[PDB]
Amino acid sequence: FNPYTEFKEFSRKQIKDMEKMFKQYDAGRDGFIDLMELKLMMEKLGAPQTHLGLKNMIKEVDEDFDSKLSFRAFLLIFRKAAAGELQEDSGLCVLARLSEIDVSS
Ligand SMILES: [Ca+2]
């Protein structure tokens, strides 16, 4: 898929930064962040989430029904963040905040 045409609100630098973080936490190297990998990510960032909380984070952006996060789903988190669509202090809000990738340009 082409992230550059699908997510025109982000510069190529920003998309590559997001790719850097995505790859860092896809420990399995399969191109997805699954529930267990996302559990570890939230722990490492210092904001651990419950079983079902993590499932709901994935559900919110998993528009392709992978039951895990593709890179498209990951970018969608930042799109929702940048557009004010995430619930205040929700798991996805916290992920985007603690990622250190600034989308509040
Ligand atoms: Ca993976």
Numbering used by the authors: 80 to 184
Quote the original article.
EFhd2/Swiprosin-1 (EFhd2) is a cytoskeletal Ca2+-binding protein identified in human immune, brain and mast cells. EFhd2 and EFhd1 consist of a disordered N-terminal region followed by two EF-hands and a coiled-coil domain at the C-terminus.
We failed to determine the structure of the apo form of EFhd2 owing to structural instability during protein purification; however, we could determine the crystal structures of CDEFhd2 mutants defective for one Ca2+-binding site (E116A for EF1, CDEFhd2EF1; E152A for EF2, CDEFhd2EF2). Furthermore, comparison of the crystallographic B-factors between Ca2+-bound and EF-hand mutant structures showed that the largest changes in B-factor values were for CDEFhd2EF1 (35.6 Å2), CDEFhd2 (20.4 Å2) and CDEFhd2EF2 (21.5 Å2). As expected, Ca2+-bound CDEFhd2 displayed a rigid conformation and CDEFhd2EF1 showed the largest degrees of mobility, indicating that Ca2+ depletion of EF1 has a larger impact on conformational dynamics. Interestingly, the C-terminal linker (residues, 176–184) followed by the LM-helix also showed significant RMSF increases in CDEFhd2EF1 and CDEFhd2EF2. Even depletion of one Ca2+ site in a two Ca2+-binding protein showed a dramatic reduction in F-actin bundling activity to a level that is similar to that of previously reported data for a two Ca2+-depleted state26.
